[PDB]
């Protein structure tokens, strides 16, 4: 029930702003100074301009390296987020990984839903629960996900914990 | 450090999925059944098709009323989220309110950043801290925000609590 650093980076809903304290609301108290996510009065820096950084709340990183929504951010030159132009990926775009766990469709585009996450899904939050492990002819997940002791790709204690065969195994 | 119903609707970061229990991770345990937000294997229903409902994680509500990202969702017929076409608002579009607290620019478009939230901002997470109250010639905030005892628009205990002049005052 806590956001930002004090909520393991949880994010408020409806772009509610997360104050410097880890509470959600709207207004200067939250959106003003120390804001850590949501609709912070001061756009956070992103993209090139800010060491490869991604925006929170699924924001489009404008060409200038500022986070937001609207033509200016999502529009031309956009560098991350639900960018107005199809973000490419997969074996089509040299192994490229969708940002923010998005699915790399069979076709080489980034998204979320059956069309992207479904059959053919190359990387990201594929819903095709494909197997890994000794169990899966020594195949490692994508996104450096954890191959749990049952040969399943995911992120968490059950996945990254004990019996973790490969991926980002808690060490 | 808890999501969904057990985290006052906090949302995991990077589209991490929130399990039926209120924990964040990636995989079937979280993305499978009971998923409450993030990249849930099963798209949540939205728009018309689902009583005016908005998608979580700033997702585009496709023409069919399913939440996601990518051309299919964000593209033509899109009904909410960082839709690929400019969502209109403000006095230009009959008082329309941007969804998900987005700013209604001076021009009548929805977004987030200086360009939308800045000078002229009509409604939403305007960063122009305009005043309300007896203090402000009996002017009420937009979005049914709370006019605190100091004549400030916001959402929270300090705003919606005691001394709340108008808005969604905790009652
Ligand atoms: C769409 C987008 O990214 N909007 C940004 C813009 C853009 O970066 C910009 O419009 C592209 O030209 O900038 C905003 O921040 C700028 C603003 O604070 C202005 C002054 O108010 O300065 C810009 O940078 C200056 C900086 O202030 C100086 O200290 C420095 O000496 O020069 C810099 C030259 O760029 C800020 O980037 C804006 O409000 O216009 C923020 C939007 O999110
Ligand atoms: C972009 C988008 O919204 N993608 C959805 C699609 C679309 O709703 C669709 O492609 C537009 O035609 O549908 C997805 O769900 C559908 C899928 O489960 C199929 C069958 O696997 O059925 C569709 O609805 C059926 C429903 O299953 C039947 O019980 C009912 O008798 O008829 C319905 C007629 O539409 C689902 O909508 C999909 O996976 O294709 C989900 C995507 O998010």
Short mmCIF file of C-alpha atoms and ligand atoms in Angstrom, two decimals:
data_model
loop_
_atom_site.label_atom_id
_atom_site.label_comp_id
_atom_site.label_asym_id
_atom_site.label_seq_id
_atom_site.Cartn_x
_atom_site.Cartn_y
_atom_site.Cartn_z
CA UNK A 1 0.00 0.00 0.00
CA UNK A 2 3.19 2.02 -0.43
CA UNK A 3 4.86 3.32 -3.64
CA UNK A 4 8.26 4.23 -5.08
CA UNK A 5 11.33 3.13 -3.05
CA UNK A 6 9.07 2.17 -0.11
CA UNK A 7 6.73 -0.07 -2.16
CA UNK A 8 9.40 -1.90 -4.11
CA UNK A 9 8.61 0.53 -6.97
CA UNK A 10 4.89 -0.17 -7.03
CA UNK A 11 3.13 2.46 -9.15
CA UNK A 12 -0.07 4.30 -8.24
CA UNK A 13 -3.04 3.74 -10.56
CA UNK A 14 -4.50 6.42 -12.86
CA UNK A 15 -1.12 8.16 -12.98
CA UNK A 16 -1.60 9.12 -9.31
CA UNK A 17 1.70 10.55 -8.14
CA UNK A 18 3.96 8.90 -5.61
CA UNK A 19 5.35 11.41 -3.09
CA UNK A 20 8.92 11.30 -1.73
CA UNK A 21 7.49 9.34 1.20
CA UNK A 22 5.87 6.49 -0.82
CA UNK A 23 2.18 7.55 -0.64
CA UNK A 24 -0.19 8.03 -3.61
CA UNK A 25 -2.31 11.08 -4.30
CA UNK A 26 -2.62 14.01 -6.65
CA UNK A 27 -1.44 17.57 -5.99
CA UNK A 28 1.72 19.46 -5.11
CA UNK A 29 2.28 17.35 -1.97
CA UNK A 30 2.65 14.33 -4.24
CA UNK A 31 3.16 15.67 -7.75
CA UNK A 32 5.53 18.44 -6.64
CA UNK A 33 9.12 17.83 -5.40
CA UNK A 34 10.41 14.33 -4.57
CA UNK A 35 7.65 12.78 -6.82
CA UNK A 36 8.94 9.35 -7.84
CA UNK A 37 6.41 8.12 -10.44
CA UNK A 38 2.89 8.88 -11.77
CA UNK A 39 2.24 12.40 -13.15
CA UNK A 40 5.15 14.25 -11.51
CA UNK A 41 5.09 18.00 -12.19
CA UNK A 42 8.64 17.54 -13.44
CA UNK A 43 8.97 15.00 -16.26
CA UNK A 44 11.60 12.36 -15.45
CA UNK A 45 14.50 12.03 -17.87
CA UNK A 46 14.61 9.02 -20.15
CA UNK A 47 16.22 7.43 -23.19
CA UNK A 48 19.71 8.27 -24.48
CA UNK A 49 19.78 11.53 -22.58
CA UNK A 50 19.45 9.56 -19.31
CA UNK A 51 21.59 6.47 -19.59
CA UNK A 52 19.18 4.17 -21.44
CA UNK A 53 16.52 4.69 -18.76
CA UNK A 54 12.87 3.80 -19.37
CA UNK A 55 9.89 5.90 -18.16
CA UNK A 56 7.64 4.68 -15.35
CA UNK A 57 3.89 4.20 -15.84
CA UNK A 58 4.44 3.01 -19.44
CA UNK A 59 5.28 6.58 -20.59
CA UNK A 60 6.65 7.45 -24.04
CA UNK A 61 10.25 8.81 -23.81
CA UNK A 62 10.23 11.84 -26.20
CA UNK A 63 13.05 12.53 -28.63
CA UNK A 64 14.56 14.95 -26.06
CA UNK A 65 14.61 12.35 -23.31
CA UNK A 66 11.59 13.49 -21.23
CA UNK A 67 8.66 11.16 -20.22
CA UNK A 68 4.97 11.86 -20.98
CA UNK A 69 1.95 11.19 -23.18
CA UNK A 70 0.58 13.04 -26.26
CA UNK A 71 1.88 13.74 -29.75
CA UNK A 72 5.00 15.51 -28.50
CA UNK A 73 6.10 12.47 -26.46
CA UNK A 74 4.55 9.52 -28.18
CA UNK A 75 4.93 11.03 -31.67
CA UNK A 76 7.92 11.18 -33.98
CA UNK A 77 11.39 10.63 -32.51
CA UNK A 78 9.76 8.78 -29.51
CA UNK A 79 12.33 6.41 -27.91
CA UNK A 80 10.43 4.02 -25.58
CA UNK A 81 6.86 3.48 -24.21
CA UNK A 82 3.67 2.95 -26.23
CA UNK A 83 5.37 4.82 -29.09
CA UNK A 84 3.10 5.77 -31.97
CA UNK A 85 5.22 3.85 -34.46
CA UNK A 86 5.68 0.06 -34.20
CA UNK A 87 8.71 -0.81 -32.07
CA UNK A 88 10.45 -3.73 -33.84
CA UNK A 89 12.10 -6.68 -32.18
CA UNK A 90 12.87 -10.34 -32.29
CA UNK A 91 15.15 -12.17 -34.69
CA UNK A 92 13.88 -9.67 -37.31
CA UNK A 93 15.66 -6.77 -35.48
CA UNK A 94 18.82 -8.53 -34.35
CA UNK A 95 17.49 -10.20 -31.15
CA UNK A 96 16.11 -6.93 -29.80
CA UNK A 97 14.12 -7.16 -26.71
CA UNK A 98 10.90 -5.30 -26.21
CA UNK A 99 11.21 -2.83 -23.35
CA UNK A 100 9.15 -3.21 -20.17
CA UNK A 101 8.46 -6.90 -20.70
CA UNK A 102 6.34 -6.41 -23.82
CA UNK A 103 5.85 -9.32 -26.11
CA UNK A 104 7.72 -9.65 -29.36
CA UNK A 105 5.13 -10.98 -31.78
CA UNK A 106 5.96 -13.64 -34.31
CA UNK A 107 6.25 -10.76 -36.78
CA UNK A 108 8.87 -8.70 -34.90
CA UNK A 109 6.68 -5.97 -33.29
CA UNK A 110 6.22 -5.11 -29.56
CA UNK A 111 2.96 -5.27 -27.71
CA UNK A 112 0.78 -6.98 -25.20
CA UNK A 113 -2.27 -9.16 -25.91
CA UNK A 114 -2.92 -12.43 -27.63
CA UNK A 115 -1.60 -11.06 -30.88
CA UNK A 116 1.81 -10.38 -29.45
CA UNK A 117 1.94 -12.66 -26.47
CA UNK A 118 0.36 -15.59 -28.23
CA UNK A 119 1.58 -18.33 -30.49
CA UNK A 120 4.94 -17.36 -32.02
CA UNK A 121 5.79 -14.92 -29.16
CA UNK A 122 9.53 -14.40 -29.31
CA UNK A 123 10.43 -12.78 -25.97
CA UNK A 124 8.79 -10.77 -23.17
CA UNK A 125 5.57 -11.76 -21.33
CA UNK A 126 4.73 -14.49 -23.77
CA UNK A 127 1.72 -16.41 -22.45
CA UNK A 128 2.94 -19.58 -24.17
CA UNK A 129 4.46 -20.95 -20.97
CA UNK A 130 7.33 -22.59 -22.87
CA UNK A 131 9.67 -24.80 -20.89
CA UNK A 132 13.33 -24.50 -20.04
CA UNK A 133 15.81 -26.64 -18.09
CA UNK A 134 17.50 -30.01 -18.29
CA UNK A 135 13.85 -30.73 -18.81
CA UNK A 136 13.81 -28.61 -21.96
CA UNK A 137 16.97 -29.65 -23.79
CA UNK A 138 18.98 -27.10 -21.82
CA UNK A 139 17.08 -24.11 -23.12
CA UNK A 140 17.27 -20.86 -21.27
CA UNK A 141 14.49 -18.31 -21.11
CA UNK A 142 14.57 -14.89 -22.74
CA UNK A 143 14.78 -11.63 -20.73
CA UNK A 144 17.12 -13.42 -18.36
CA UNK A 145 14.03 -14.80 -16.67
CA UNK A 146 14.47 -17.52 -14.10
CA UNK A 147 14.10 -21.14 -15.10
CA UNK A 148 12.53 -22.62 -11.95
CA UNK A 149 13.10 -26.21 -10.72
CA UNK A 150 10.02 -27.29 -12.66
CA UNK A 151 11.39 -25.87 -15.94
CA UNK A 152 9.22 -22.72 -16.10
CA UNK A 153 10.10 -19.15 -17.06
CA UNK A 154 9.09 -16.41 -14.62
CA UNK A 155 10.37 -13.89 -12.12
CA UNK A 156 9.94 -14.25 -8.38
CA UNK A 157 11.11 -16.23 -5.35
CA UNK A 158 9.56 -19.48 -6.63
CA UNK A 159 11.26 -18.94 -9.99
CA UNK A 160 14.51 -17.20 -9.04
CA UNK A 161 14.95 -19.07 -5.79
CA UNK A 162 16.06 -22.59 -4.98
CA UNK A 163 16.20 -25.07 -7.85
CA UNK A 164 16.62 -22.20 -10.34
CA UNK A 165 18.35 -23.76 -13.34
CA UNK A 166 19.26 -20.55 -15.24
CA UNK A 167 18.18 -16.90 -15.69
CA UNK A 168 18.39 -14.21 -12.97
CA UNK A 169 18.60 -16.78 -10.16
CA UNK A 170 18.80 -15.15 -6.72
CA UNK A 171 22.37 -15.94 -5.66
CA UNK B 1 5.05 -3.73 -1.31
CA UNK B 2 1.76 -5.40 -2.25
CA UNK B 3 -0.35 -5.04 -5.44
CA UNK B 4 -3.93 -5.26 -6.69
CA UNK B 5 -6.67 -5.38 -4.01
CA UNK B 6 -4.03 -5.88 -1.29
CA UNK B 7 -1.90 -2.85 -2.28
CA UNK B 8 -4.74 -0.40 -2.75
CA UNK B 9 -4.40 -1.12 -6.51
CA UNK B 10 -0.70 -0.36 -6.70
CA UNK B 11 0.69 -1.58 -10.03
CA UNK B 12 3.92 -3.53 -10.54
CA UNK B 13 6.58 -1.82 -12.65
CA UNK B 14 7.65 -3.01 -16.12
CA UNK B 15 4.22 -4.59 -16.64
CA UNK B 16 5.14 -7.18 -13.98
CA UNK B 17 1.98 -9.11 -13.22
CA UNK B 18 0.11 -8.96 -9.95
CA UNK B 19 -1.02 -12.41 -8.79
CA UNK B 20 -4.39 -13.09 -7.10
CA UNK B 21 -2.53 -12.73 -3.80
CA UNK B 22 -1.09 -9.21 -4.39
CA UNK B 23 2.55 -10.11 -5.22
CA UNK B 24 4.50 -9.02 -8.32
CA UNK B 25 6.42 -11.29 -10.67
CA UNK B 26 6.33 -12.71 -14.15
CA UNK B 27 5.13 -16.18 -15.15
CA UNK B 28 2.05 -18.37 -14.89
CA UNK B 29 1.96 -18.05 -11.08
CA UNK B 30 1.40 -14.33 -11.54
CA UNK B 31 0.40 -13.83 -15.16
CA UNK B 32 -1.89 -16.87 -15.24
CA UNK B 33 -5.27 -17.05 -13.41
CA UNK B 34 -6.33 -14.42 -10.83
CA UNK B 35 -3.83 -11.89 -12.39
CA UNK B 36 -5.13 -8.44 -11.46
CA UNK B 37 -2.91 -6.03 -13.45
CA UNK B 38 0.38 -5.93 -15.42
CA UNK B 39 0.74 -8.33 -18.39
CA UNK B 40 -2.00 -10.84 -17.49
CA UNK B 41 -2.16 -13.79 -19.89
CA UNK B 42 -5.82 -12.91 -20.30
CA UNK B 43 -6.42 -9.34 -21.47
CA UNK B 44 -8.84 -7.50 -19.17
CA UNK B 45 -12.01 -6.15 -20.73
CA UNK B 46 -12.32 -2.41 -21.25
CA UNK B 47 -14.25 0.39 -22.92
CA UNK B 48 -17.90 0.16 -23.99
CA UNK B 49 -17.83 -3.61 -23.90
CA UNK B 50 -17.02 -3.45 -20.16
CA UNK B 51 -19.08 -0.68 -18.64
CA UNK B 52 -16.84 2.30 -19.45
CA UNK B 53 -13.89 0.65 -17.71
CA UNK B 54 -10.32 1.84 -18.28
CA UNK B 55 -7.28 -0.48 -18.62
CA UNK B 56 -4.65 -0.69 -15.89
CA UNK B 57 -0.98 0.09 -16.57
CA UNK B 58 -1.94 2.84 -19.05
CA UNK B 59 -3.04 0.25 -21.65
CA UNK B 60 -4.87 1.10 -24.89
CA UNK B 61 -8.45 -0.32 -24.88
CA UNK B 62 -8.84 -1.83 -28.41
CA UNK B 63 -11.97 -1.35 -30.49
CA UNK B 64 -13.22 -4.76 -29.24
CA UNK B 65 -12.83 -3.81 -25.60
CA UNK B 66 -9.60 -5.71 -24.72
CA UNK B 67 -6.50 -4.06 -23.10
CA UNK B 68 -2.96 -4.18 -24.57
CA UNK B 69 -0.23 -2.44 -26.55
CA UNK B 70 0.68 -2.53 -30.28
CA UNK B 71 -1.09 -1.51 -33.48
CA UNK B 72 -4.08 -3.76 -32.84
CA UNK B 73 -4.81 -2.12 -29.47
CA UNK B 74 -3.39 1.35 -29.74
CA UNK B 75 -4.26 1.68 -33.44
CA UNK B 76 -7.53 2.57 -35.14
CA UNK B 77 -10.77 2.23 -33.15
CA UNK B 78 -8.70 2.46 -29.87
CA UNK B 79 -10.97 3.68 -27.01
CA UNK B 80 -8.70 4.72 -24.09
CA UNK B 81 -4.97 4.65 -23.09
CA UNK B 82 -2.05 6.19 -25.00
CA UNK B 83 -4.16 5.88 -28.16
CA UNK B 84 -2.31 6.51 -31.41
CA UNK B 85 -4.67 9.31 -32.37
CA UNK B 86 -4.97 12.49 -30.27
CA UNK B 87 -7.67 12.13 -27.61
CA UNK B 88 -9.53 15.48 -27.51
CA UNK B 89 -10.85 17.21 -24.44
CA UNK B 90 -11.51 20.44 -22.68
CA UNK B 91 -14.01 23.12 -23.59
CA UNK B 92 -13.18 22.24 -27.22
CA UNK B 93 -14.79 18.76 -26.81
CA UNK B 94 -17.73 19.65 -24.57
CA UNK B 95 -15.95 19.62 -21.16
CA UNK B 96 -14.51 16.15 -21.74
CA UNK B 97 -12.14 14.93 -19.21
CA UNK B 98 -8.95 13.17 -20.08
CA UNK B 99 -8.96 9.62 -18.76
CA UNK B 100 -6.51 8.49 -16.08
CA UNK B 101 -5.76 12.00 -14.85
CA UNK B 102 -4.08 13.14 -18.06
CA UNK B 103 -3.78 16.80 -18.71
CA UNK B 104 -6.05 18.60 -21.13
CA UNK B 105 -3.75 21.01 -22.92
CA UNK B 106 -4.80 24.54 -23.73
CA UNK B 107 -5.50 23.19 -27.22
CA UNK B 108 -7.93 20.40 -26.24
CA UNK B 109 -5.64 17.31 -26.44
CA UNK B 110 -4.73 14.77 -23.69
CA UNK B 111 -1.27 14.12 -22.42
CA UNK B 112 1.27 14.49 -19.70
CA UNK B 113 4.28 16.84 -19.65
CA UNK B 114 4.81 20.56 -19.66
CA UNK B 115 3.04 20.87 -22.96
CA UNK B 116 -0.17 19.47 -21.61
CA UNK B 117 0.15 20.03 -17.92
CA UNK B 118 1.59 23.50 -18.23
CA UNK B 119 0.18 26.95 -18.72
CA UNK B 120 -3.38 26.72 -20.09
CA UNK B 121 -3.94 23.19 -18.67
CA UNK B 122 -7.68 22.67 -18.57
CA UNK B 123 -8.20 19.62 -16.34
CA UNK B 124 -6.28 16.56 -15.09
CA UNK B 125 -2.82 16.65 -13.43
CA UNK B 126 -2.21 20.25 -14.33
CA UNK B 127 1.01 21.39 -12.65
CA UNK B 128 -0.32 24.96 -12.46
CA UNK B 129 -1.37 24.57 -8.83
CA UNK B 130 -4.40 26.82 -9.32
CA UNK B 131 -6.40 27.73 -6.24
CA UNK B 132 -9.93 26.93 -5.18
CA UNK B 133 -12.06 27.79 -2.14
CA UNK B 134 -13.65 30.78 -0.48
CA UNK B 135 -10.08 31.78 -1.05
CA UNK B 136 -10.51 31.44 -4.81
CA UNK B 137 -13.85 33.13 -5.49
CA UNK B 138 -15.66 29.88 -4.75
CA UNK B 139 -14.05 27.95 -7.56
CA UNK B 140 -14.11 24.21 -7.49
CA UNK B 141 -11.41 21.99 -8.94
CA UNK B 142 -11.82 19.77 -11.99
CA UNK B 143 -11.88 15.94 -11.79
CA UNK B 144 -13.83 16.29 -8.58
CA UNK B 145 -10.51 16.80 -6.84
CA UNK B 146 -10.52 17.93 -3.25
CA UNK B 147 -10.16 21.59 -2.41
CA UNK B 148 -8.16 21.42 0.83
CA UNK B 149 -8.45 23.95 3.69
CA UNK B 150 -5.60 25.94 2.13
CA UNK B 151 -7.43 26.23 -1.22
CA UNK B 152 -5.40 23.62 -3.15
CA UNK B 153 -6.51 20.92 -5.59
CA UNK B 154 -5.29 17.38 -4.92
CA UNK B 155 -6.32 13.92 -3.80
CA UNK B 156 -5.41 12.46 -0.44
CA UNK B 157 -6.12 12.69 3.29
CA UNK B 158 -4.63 16.20 3.55
CA UNK B 159 -6.77 17.29 0.59
CA UNK B 160 -9.92 15.21 1.00
CA UNK B 161 -9.88 15.27 4.77
CA UNK B 162 -10.76 17.92 7.31
CA UNK B 163 -11.19 21.47 6.03
CA UNK B 164 -12.02 20.14 2.55
CA UNK B 165 -14.06 22.90 0.92
CA UNK B 166 -15.32 20.97 -2.16
CA UNK B 167 -14.43 18.02 -4.45
CA UNK B 168 -14.37 14.35 -3.36
CA UNK B 169 -14.14 15.24 0.34
CA UNK B 170 -13.94 12.15 2.57
CA UNK B 171 -17.32 12.22 4.32
C1 LIG C 1 8.40 17.04 -25.68
C2 LIG C 1 9.44 17.24 -24.63
O1 LIG C 1 10.43 16.53 -24.44
N1 LIG C 1 9.17 18.32 -23.89
C3 LIG C 1 10.11 18.78 -22.86
C4 LIG C 1 10.80 20.01 -23.45
C5 LIG C 1 11.79 19.67 -24.55
O2 LIG C 1 13.01 19.09 -24.04
C6 LIG C 1 11.99 20.78 -25.52
O3 LIG C 1 10.84 21.55 -25.71
C7 LIG C 1 12.78 20.56 -26.77
O4 LIG C 1 13.29 21.88 -27.18
O5 LIG C 1 11.47 20.82 -22.52
C8 LIG C 1 10.88 21.09 -21.25
O6 LIG C 1 11.96 21.42 -20.39
C9 LIG C 1 12.82 22.46 -20.84
C10 LIG C 1 12.52 23.75 -20.09
O7 LIG C 1 12.72 23.55 -18.69
C11 LIG C 1 13.36 24.85 -20.64
C12 LIG C 1 13.30 26.15 -19.92
O8 LIG C 1 12.12 26.30 -19.13
O9 LIG C 1 14.76 24.49 -20.73
C13 LIG C 1 15.04 23.29 -21.38
O10 LIG C 1 16.39 22.96 -21.24
C14 LIG C 1 17.29 24.08 -21.09
C15 LIG C 1 17.61 24.21 -19.60
O11 LIG C 1 16.48 24.81 -18.88
C16 LIG C 1 18.82 25.10 -19.35
O12 LIG C 1 19.23 25.01 -17.93
C17 LIG C 1 19.97 24.78 -20.27
O13 LIG C 1 20.97 25.86 -20.11
O14 LIG C 1 19.52 24.72 -21.61
C18 LIG C 1 18.56 23.70 -21.86
C19 LIG C 1 18.37 23.64 -23.37
O15 LIG C 1 17.42 22.64 -23.80
C20 LIG C 1 14.30 22.14 -20.75
O16 LIG C 1 14.63 20.97 -21.46
C21 LIG C 1 9.93 22.29 -21.19
O17 LIG C 1 9.25 22.57 -20.23
O18 LIG C 1 9.87 22.96 -22.30
C22 LIG C 1 10.24 19.84 -20.63
C23 LIG C 1 9.35 19.06 -21.59
O19 LIG C 1 9.03 17.79 -20.97
C1 LIG C 2 -7.13 -6.57 -30.70
C2 LIG C 2 -8.04 -7.28 -29.76
O1 LIG C 2 -8.97 -6.79 -29.12
N1 LIG C 2 -7.71 -8.58 -29.66
C3 LIG C 2 -8.53 -9.51 -28.88
C4 LIG C 2 -9.33 -10.32 -29.89
C5 LIG C 2 -10.44 -9.53 -30.55
O2 LIG C 2 -11.56 -9.31 -29.68
C6 LIG C 2 -10.80 -10.05 -31.90
O3 LIG C 2 -9.71 -10.59 -32.59
C7 LIG C 2 -11.73 -9.28 -32.78
O4 LIG C 2 -12.33 -10.25 -33.70
O5 LIG C 2 -9.89 -11.50 -29.39
C8 LIG C 2 -9.16 -12.33 -28.49
O6 LIG C 2 -10.13 -13.07 -27.76
C9 LIG C 2 -11.07 -13.80 -28.55
C10 LIG C 2 -10.72 -15.28 -28.56
O7 LIG C 2 -10.73 -15.78 -27.22
C11 LIG C 2 -11.67 -16.00 -29.46
C12 LIG C 2 -11.55 -17.48 -29.46
O8 LIG C 2 -10.28 -17.96 -29.01
O9 LIG C 2 -13.05 -15.69 -29.18
C13 LIG C 2 -13.37 -14.33 -29.13
O10 LIG C 2 -14.68 -14.16 -28.67
C14 LIG C 2 -15.59 -15.24 -28.97
C15 LIG C 2 -15.72 -16.08 -27.70
O11 LIG C 2 -14.53 -16.92 -27.51
C16 LIG C 2 -16.92 -17.02 -27.76
O12 LIG C 2 -17.14 -17.64 -26.42
C17 LIG C 2 -18.16 -16.34 -28.25
O13 LIG C 2 -19.17 -17.39 -28.51
O14 LIG C 2 -17.89 -15.63 -29.44
C18 LIG C 2 -16.93 -14.58 -29.30
C19 LIG C 2 -16.94 -13.79 -30.59
O15 LIG C 2 -16.02 -12.68 -30.61
C20 LIG C 2 -12.52 -13.61 -28.12
O16 LIG C 2 -12.90 -12.25 -28.13
C21 LIG C 2 -8.25 -13.38 -29.13
O17 LIG C 2 -7.46 -14.06 -28.53
O18 LIG C 2 -8.35 -13.43 -30.43
C22 LIG C 2 -8.40 -11.51 -27.44
C23 LIG C 2 -7.62 -10.34 -28.00
O19 LIG C 2 -7.18 -9.52 -26.90
#
